[PDB]
């Protein structure tokens, strides 16, 4: 049912990079309602709602999970619980290596899967093509340079 | 399907105590084929079978999970992934406190549930009654004293 | 009986923010005879009445309670007694984090329920939508900007 | 329904005095299945049950609450929520000043009700007479001296 | 011809506020191919083109003009030349008082036409309604409370 | 006549352990007036009474005797005279090996009769069954796990 | 009458090996109430009973006697009187060489009868088959390997 | 074509353990013309033949590989080349941890596939059942005990 | 005649940036023969050839001249002479601000012509489009994301 | 199927020299979509693909393989597995001795096949001629001098 959503599994200590990533996803043309990002007031959890039950519903109905791996991802319990919850159900997933992560991919995640980096223009081009293939969208060159500049200046 | 099995989540650094615990169950009348303790040659994963897929089959089919909580259950990625896998599926659960766990319950595990201790005679009596109610068995007092003595000497 | 009334639980040291909040509630179109705010001469306890008997009569009848959670709310015996009363009675409840509060939600109040903030414009929009849905009201954009500006000026 | 049961409200930092008090309660002739002392393995919450739901049901049903007033009863949130819970429901109550407490009775508890001390023999005689009258029991003098000696030895 | 293209007359020392204003114009839904903001690489003069003939053609063709007046708009020969060209050609005009400008509207621009302030929620609401009516657009409140927050954060 | 009484022969140097033993009986359901223990103020000899005539009369009438055998029972004259009186009168008797005794059962006591240990849980279960069958009593497990814990902690 | 009961003749010094052998007998499926192992509390002599009269009655009624021949068996009187009592009555008997016994069989037990050593897998298989034939039981291979490993670990 | 053979990858420094393992395989009923153990004159490379072309043909045509993993297995280049050759060809394979190998699996062989240890009787029972199911053979319990004794003597 | 040939006018103290620029031009698909960059052994002046006459033969016949403007370009005597030689003949021209040039354009170069900066992705996109328009070439994205990366890594 | 592709086996510690060699391969005329160099983002494994199955398919389909033999090529397990895969599959092979390697050619690759050096002009000429004959290309000396200088500078 919810296969079209994008559950961005992350840590709260990676706020800025994940914010920039979500903003780029919006810029390419992803509807702002399809990103279940629980660290932004505009995609977070509705008020007067159960947090964990709200997450469980989305994970159970099937959501494209995004592991934004980093050191803090493996230092937080809830992130590993989410990894297990998406492993057992066999939800569509994808790994994203945040800058500065030189560690080992532990846990029950598929360790023999190629991860997406976010460090050089070719990486961003590959990610853009991935998203456009996923949601069947279209983007033009001038816009792509503008978005790339925005993302790069956000990280800096 | 596999609602009558027991999945003893644990850390391999707590091999001794858990061992005794599982043995206790077999004394009360739990068939040795129900426990899926994966740190004993007689209950572990059969040879030439994928480990993680084998565990996932049982967790997905609805094994009655036991959380053998301790300072090591929160310092192992696979145990937290197991916690997450049981959380999102709504598997029947039950907490257990290993001796010396003077700490806080974290993660998505129900923090307001009542845990079972394994220190005093009343604790073991309550656990025995729990298991007897679960599997619909009967026991005699003399057997119970023998089993309790065995368990206590094993822990020491 | 008193299901449609609002019992604004608060600490007397947060008078200004609660005054602005209740004034905004009235502005949106909530009749001033429903709000029960015992730090204002116009909603407080009538004269020649028993304070605690009046408050208990209102709570026991099912007043929709709002928790003005802040640092002074958890340093006031009477406020915690109101929290316990509404907890046991199972009254409809809603949490509101006053500006500047970054603590932990202790007590028997549901800790996994999402709280309403009062900092960004989106929080006030969500609060306005909640109130309009609750009381079946309507509002116009111009009035909304005027009310928001009034609230911001009051807090400033 | 639960008028006869005794709900011993207390703080977890007053375990020794409350243990002596509850043991004396049992000695006088009160069956241990009525006391709902929560810091005792033989009176606490059954395993696999919700803590707060259990306590809330017991209070809502009309348990005869006892206040163990001390310097820690007014430095513990949950105790004050219990106070408010028993205040709003109008449950039968009774104050008990633990030894060493010389403070002021705050909160919504009746401040003009006479409290029970636990220091001198006349206080224990009055408490014993209260319990015997409440539960319609009988006692003999020799047993009373033995119980008093046991209590005083426990406190020392 | 170029009647639907916004020409943004401004000084080069007020580039931050004009950048925020143009970004808001784009957010409401104004195509980036219309705004002519010669202090931005994505809206400025194409390379290998005459700087002044380009603006001369754009003004002569009838571009809607926005006067971003401030203390620098009256200290720049080129800005006053654009004002004169707009006055002589009788192009559609709209005034805009940048924050901090509390002076007289000199020159040949209509001193009786009402200006558009940008320093309060009602002003931004009026500007948004003006633009939506101008280009026959549509906007939703949930997006508006985010766009306004973006603008305020930029100006702050 | 006094067959229903119990005469606990012992040595004062074993005051502690013997004490606990007597209390255990009192918990099982033994009337406190049927235990003639001459080292506790509540069972000892009355005042203004001959110390030795009391014991002589009680032994003559046929009190059941429990030999608390230890290294001090064989280093105290009076204990040996009590053993001789029991032997000559042929009163019902039972041996009890206190923790620590590893010597030989000397004297005129029947050396072939099996003793009663008080070390392991099975020994306490056998003692409980003996007392229950002797005095025609009844007990419940939930209270036995508490009585045994009391005994063990007192001896500890 | 008691021909279905086992009587394990042995010396108290050879305790560990006999304990392991009795446990092996119990796991094979022999009721724990048939083995008469006086060095174990769970099969020993009931309290307040004549030791020698009890053993004499059990041997007179009839019982298989397993001679745990060893060096200490021929250095203890009571073992030799047990052997003589078995011989005179024509009780069914079996021999069981304990590890390390490289001496000569003496006394009145048939010196030509074949004994049951226990120091290799084949001996344990033969013993298991003998016991199964005796009591008409059934065993499975996996359980047999588990029991063999347990016994070997205990002897080690 | 040669899928019924058993290619036994190993290192020449593990001659004794692999010799015992191959002898056990033959004893269970595996024809000596199937095993291709290189370090034995009765299963080695026939004379006047290319050393490597023979193994190349056997691996290419299909052969059940037996990774006899150990420390010396990861210091021999040829062993790693055989590992790669069987990996790319998709050859049926199994893993066997030799005694004393405390390391971790590396290379391109499934690290999540369960292996067959050879330490305890249950491991040998599992291996025996595996082989019997593989080649559709039969065995007798006494024969199995003799074979296990021989293997243990060889390994000792 | 030589209108196709490019004539990169520069200063020898801007060697690195001009080298990177020429390499980018070559990568896009400009024949290495066309560029008349004189600071490279591969495009410079042949041997045994007059320098100034060789440059004049190209400037006179017509050649797209690129002005790599910088502080050093206005600090040399030959660069200004090339500027005048291309001004008098009216050869096709193009300006290029090398990074760090914050000065004012002087001389007889058209000072109202928009110049190509090289700092940000949009500038390089515009340059690429200009060159593709010039020489009628085609370039794919995956190649551009690599050529651009080469350029920035060289300039860094 | 993949006879016209190049697979470049190497260690990850010799990435600089292999990068220079691959750049030279592209310079000579080899299309960039034929070199499979997994240490470069532009030739590596596409994202969201199995790392090992991709190389397995490429090798199984018959990719021309170059062995970047060196000291680090014999300390890597994966390289020795690719060597075995090529040996068993009989893929076309070519050796390349990286600078500084003065050891023995072990493994299962032809030790009597002459290798290719990369340290003197004649070696690079031979490599260039080999590649040109392989792919049926053409090159000019004026370009060859620049390519050789580039390679030498890169290695320097």
Distance CA E78, CA F70 (A): 116
Q: Which of J23, J53, J82, J104 is catalytic?
A: J82
User: What is d(CA E145, CA E150) in angstroms, rounded to the nearest whole number?
Assistant: 9
Task: Enumerate the residues of chain E whose CB falls inside 8 A of the CB of residue C142.
Answer: 122, 125
Kindly determine whether residue H114 and residue B46, on different chains, have CB atoms separated by under 8 Å.
yes
Question: Is B1 buried (19+), middle (13-18) or exposed (0-12) by CB count in 10 A?
Answer: exposed
Q: At E77, list the tokens.
A: 């020969």
Yes or no: say if G116 and G94 are a contact pair by the CB < 8 Å rule: yes
CB J55 within 8 A of CB J38: yes
C84 touches chain D (CB under 8 A): yes
Enumerate the residues of chain A whose CB falls inside 8 A of the CB of residue I120. Answer: 149
How many whole angstroms separate alpha carbon D131 and alpha carbon D147? 14
DSSP for chain D, written as a single string: --SSSEEEE--GGGHHHHHHHHHHHHHHT--TTTB--SSSTTTSPPTTS-HHHHHHHHHHHT-EEEEEESTTTTS-HHHHHHHHHHHHHT----EEE-TT------TTS-TTSPPBP-SSHHHHHHHHHHHHHHHT----HHHHHHHHHHHHHHH-
- Count of C-beta atoms within a 10 Å radius of residue A6: 23
DSSP H or E segment with residue H67: strand H64-69
* The CA-based dihedral angle spanning residues J107, J113, J118, J119, taken in that order and rounded to the nearest 10 degrees: 100
Asked whether at least 3 C-beta pairs link B and A within 8 Å, the reply is: yes
Mapped onto helix, strand or coil, the DSSP state of residue E12 is: coil
Q: For residue A140, what is the nearest residue in chain I, using CA coordinates? A: I141
Token duo for residue A154: 């956000």
Structure tokens belonging to residue I150: 């080469």
Contacts of E12 in chain I (CB under 8 A): none
User: Nearest residue on chain A to I143, judged by CA atoms?
Assistant: A122
List the beta strands (DSSP E) in chain A. Answer: 6-9, 35-36, 64-69, 95-97
Chains B and H touch (3+ CB pairs under 8 A): yes
Strands of the sheet containing J6-9, edge to edge, are J35-36, J6-9, J64-69, J93-97
Q: Inter-chain contact A125–I145, Cβ cutoff 8 Å?
A: yes
For residues F129-153, one letter each, b for 16 or more C-beta atoms within 10 angstroms of the residue's C-beta and e for the rest, the string is eebeeeeeeeeeeeebbbbbeebee
Give contacts of J51 with chain A, Cβ < 8 Å.
112-114
Phi, psi of E154 (to 5 degrees): -60, -50
**Which of E121, E123, E129, E143 should be substituted to probe chain C, the one whose Cβ sees the most C Cβ atoms within 10 Å?**
E121
Q: Which residues of chain D are within 8 Å of residue C107 when distances are taken between CB atoms?
A: 77-78, 81
CA–CA separation, H82 vs H59, rounded Å? 8
Q: Are D9 and D63 in contact (CB under 8 A)?
A: no
Spatial distance between the Cα atoms of F8 and F37, rounded to a whole number of angstroms? 6
Beta strands in I10-139 (DSSP E): 64-69, 93-97, 116-117
- Is there a contact between G75 and G11 (Cβ–Cβ < 8 Å)? yes
Q: Contact, I108 vs I82, CB < 8 A?
A: no
Cross-chain residue pair B113–D50, CB shorter than 8 Å: yes
Contacts of B118 (CB under 8 A, 6+ apart): B21, B96, B97, B98, B99, B124, B127
- The H-or-E segment that residue G56 falls in is helix G51-61
**By CB neighbour count within 10 A (0-12 exposed, 13-18 middle, 19+ buried), where does C26 fall?**
middle
Q: Do D47 and B122 count as a contact with CB atoms less than 8 A apart?
A: no
C135 by DSSP, 3-state: which?
helix
* Cβ partners under 8 Å of residue J6, min gap 6: J25, J30, J34, J35, J36, J63, J64, J65, J66
The whole-angstrom separation of Cα G112 and Cα E110 is 135
b/e per residue E59-81 (b: at least 16 CB within 10 A): beebbbbbbbbbebbbebeebbe
Alpha-carbon distance values, A58 to A23, A52, A88, B88, I55 (Å): 21, 10, 14, 10, 71
Do the chains J and B touch each other, judged by at least 3 C-beta pairs below 8 angstroms? no
Question: How many CA atoms, within 13 angstroms, populate the side-chain half-sphere of residue E78?
Answer: 10
The whole-angstrom separation of Cα F116 and Cα I132 is: 106
- How would you list the strands of the sheet with E93-97, edge to edge? E6-9, E64-69, E93-97
Instruction: Output the six-digit token pair for J114.
Output: 């002459």
CB atoms within 10 A of CB E99: 12
Angle between helices A15-28 and A141-155 (to 10 degrees): 170
Q: Which of H93, H118, H98, H96 is nearest to H108 (CA)?
A: H93
The span from the CA of A154 to the CA of C30, in Å, is 43
Of J68, J63, J4, J54, nearest in space to J31 by CA: J4
Alpha-carbon span I56 to I62, nearest angstrom: 10
Sign of CA dihedral C122, C124, C126, C128: negative
Instruction: Sheet containing I116-117: give its strands across.
Output: I6-9, I64-69, I93-97, I116-117
The terminus-to-terminus CA distance of chain C in angstroms comes to: 38
Search chain B and give the residue with CA nearest H66: B48
φ/ψ (deg, to 5) at I97: -85, 110
**From CA H45, how far away is CA H36, in angstroms rounded?**
8
B78 and A108 within 8 Å at the Cβ level: the answer is: yes
Q: G2: distance to nearest CA of chain B, Å?
A: 22
CB atoms within 10 A of CB C31: 11
**Which chains sit next to D, with 3 or more Cβ pairs under 8 A?**
B, C, F
* A155/A15 Cα distance (integer angstroms): 11
Asked whether the beta carbons of E14 and E98 are under 8 A apart, the reply is: yes
The token pair at A91 is: 């939800």
| I76 SS3 class | coil
The phi, psi pair for C111, rounded to 5°, reads: -85, -15
Angle at the Cα of F130 (from F128 to F132), degrees rounded to 5? 70
- For the record, the structure tokens of I148 come out as 């651009």
Answer whether I147's CB lies under 8 Å from I124's CB. no
State CA F90 to chain mean position distance.
17
CA G65, CA G7: separation in Å to the nearest integer? Answer: 5
Taking CA atoms, F2 is separated from F27, F62, F135, G118, in Å, by 22, 6, 14, 57
CA angle I98–I104–I106, rounded 5-degree value: 100
B133 Cα to chain D: minimum distance (Å): 13
What is the token pair recorded at J18? 């292999």
Shortest Cα–Cα distance, C88 to chain D (Å)? 6
**Is I114 close to E41, i.e. CB distance below 8 A?**
no
Name chain I contacts of A122, Cβ cutoff 8 Å: 142, 145-146, 149
Which residue of chain B is at minimal alpha-carbon distance from D53?
B112
* Distance, CA of H62 to CA of B43 (rounded, Å): 33
Please identify every residue of D annotated as catalytic.
Answer: 82
G82 among known catalytic residues:
yes
CA atoms of F115 and F119, how far apart (whole Å): 12
Say which of F120, F122, F141 has its CB closest to residue B125: F141
Give residues with Cβ within 8 angstroms of I13, minimum separation 6.
I72
Sheet strands side by side (includes B64-69): B6-9, B64-69, B95-97, B116-117
B88 and A60 in contact by Cβ < 8 A?
yes
CA-wise closest residue to D36 among D66, D79, D77 = D66
Q: Count residue pairs from G and H with Cβ separation < 8 A.
A: 23
Collect all residues with Cβ–Cβ distance below 8 Å to G120 and sequence separation of at least 6. H149
**Structural tokens at position J142:** 């004026």
Partner I contacted by A33 (CB < 8 A): no
The stretches of I12-118 forming alpha helices (DSSP H) are: 15-28, 51-61, 78-89
Q: Which of G42, G43, G145 to mutate to test the interface with B (most CBs of B within 10 A)?
A: G42
Q: Which residues of B touch D42 (CB under 8 A)?
A: 122
Where does C2-156 show beta strands of DSSP type E? Answer: 6-9, 35-36, 64-69, 93-97
Domain C6-155 adopts which CATH fold? Rossmann fold (3.40.50)
Which 3 state secondary structure label does DSSP give A8? strand
Contacts of B120 (CB under 8 A, 6+ apart): D41, F149
Give CA separation, C48 vs A145, C51, C89, G39, G146, in Å. Answer: 73, 9, 27, 85, 83
I and A in touch (3+ CB pairs within 8 angstroms): yes
Lookup: tokens for I19 = 């080298």
Q: Which E residues, 105 through 144, put their C-beta within 8 Å of a C-beta on chain A?
A: none
CA–CA dist A67, A80 (Å, integer): 10
Q: Which helix (H) or strand (E) element contains residue H93? A: strand H93-97
| Rounded-to-integer distance, Cα A133 and Cα A138, Å | 9
Q: How many CB atoms lie within 10 A of CB D146?
A: 15
β-pair partners for H113: B50
Longest dimension (CA), chain H: 43
Which chain B residues are Cβ-neighbours of A74 within 8 angstroms? Answer: 77
Report in angstroms the alpha-carbon separations of E132 from C142, C145, E67, E125, E135: 16, 18, 19, 11, 6
Q: Does E42 touch chain A (CB under 8 A)?
A: yes
Tokens of B11: 């850390």
Q: Supply the DSSP string of chain J, one letter for each residue.
A: --TT-EEEE--TT-HHHHHHHHHHHHHHT--TTTEE-TTSTTTSPPSSSBHHHHHHHHHHTT-EEEEEESSTTSS-HHHHHHHHHHHHHT--EEEEE-TT--S---SSS-SSS--B--SSHHHHHHHHHHHHHHHT----HHHHHHHHHHHHHHH-
Residues E94 and E116: beta-carbon distance below 8 Å: yes
| Interchain pair F114, G51: CB under 8 A | yes
Q: Which residue of B has its CA nearest to H123?
A: B41
Cα(D86)–Cα(D77) distance, rounded to whole angstroms?
15
Which residue from C minimizes the CA distance to E121?
A: C145
Contact (Cβ atoms closer than 8 angstroms) between residue B66 and residue B7: yes
Q: What are the chain J neighbours of H78 within 8 Å (beta carbons)?
A: 107-108
The DSSP secondary structure of B23-74, one letter per residue, reads HHHHHHT--TTTB--TTSTTTSPPTTSBHHHHHHHHHHHT-EEEEEESTTTT
Give Cα J51 to chain centroid, integer Å.
19
Which position has the token pair 């223990």?
F37
Contacts of J146 in chain I (CB under 8 A): 42
CA–CA separation, C96 and C67 (whole Å): 6
DSSP string, B101-142: --S---SSS-TTSPPEE-SSHHHHHHHHHHHHHHHT----HH
- Per DSSP, the three-state class of H115 is coil
User: Is the Cβ–Cβ distance between F147 and F24 less than 8 Å?
Assistant: yes
**Which three-class secondary structure state does DSSP give residue C153?**
helix
- What is the DSSP track for chain F? --TTSEEEE--GGGHHHHHHHHHHHHHHT--GGGEE-TTSTTTS--TTS-HHHHHHHHHHHT-EEEEEESTTTTS-HHHHHHHHHHHHHT--EEEEE-TT--S---TTS-SSB---B-SSHHHHHHHHHHHHHHHT----HHHHHHHHHHHHHHH-
- Where residue C139 falls (left for φ over 0; alpha for ψ -120 to 50; beta otherwise) is beta
Residue C1 near residue C61, CB atoms below 8 Å = yes
Q: Which of B122, B142, B145 sits opposite F146 (nearest CB)?
A: B122
Q: Does A145 touch chain I (CB under 8 A)?
A: yes
Residue of A nearest to C117 (CA): A47
Judged by phi (left if over 0) then psi (alpha if -120 to 50, else beta), residue C61 lies in alpha
What are residue B5's DSSP bridge partners? none
Experimental method: cryo-EM
Q: Hey, of F22, F23, F42, which one would you mutate to test binding to chain D, going by the most D CBs within 10 A of its CB?
A: F42
D15 vs F: CB within 8 A: no
CB contact under 8 Å between A84 and B82, yes or no, is: yes
Q: Which subunits sit against E, judged by 3+ Cβ pairs under 8 A?
A: A, C, I
Going by C-alpha positions, the residue among F63, F65, F74, F70 that lies closest to residue F118 is F70
**How long a stretch of residues is chain H?**
156
Exposure of C146 by Cβ count < 10 A (0-12 exposed, 13-18 middle, 19+ buried)?
middle
């Amino acid at each position: 049912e919810l296969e079209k959503k994008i559950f961005i599994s992350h840590s709260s200590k990676d706020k800025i990079v994940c914010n920039a990533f979500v903003e780029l996803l919006e810029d390419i043309g992803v509807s702002s309602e399809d990103i279940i990002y629980t660290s932004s007031p505009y995609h977070g959890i509705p008020g007067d709602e159960d947090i964990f039950e709200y997450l469980k519903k989305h994970l159970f109905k099937g959501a494209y999970v995004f592991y934004m791996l980093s050191d803090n991802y493996y230092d937080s319990v809830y992130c590993l619980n989410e990894m297990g919850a998406t492993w057992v159900n066999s939800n569509n997933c994808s790994t994203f290596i945040l800058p500065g992560f030189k560690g080992e991919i532990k846990g029950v995640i598929d360790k023999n899967k190629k991860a997406f980096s976010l460090e050089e223009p070719i990486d961003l081009f590959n990610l853009k093509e991935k998203i456009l293939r996923m949601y069947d969208l279209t983007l033009e060159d001038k816009k792509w340079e503008r978005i790339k500049a925005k993302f790069n200046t956000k990280l800096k």
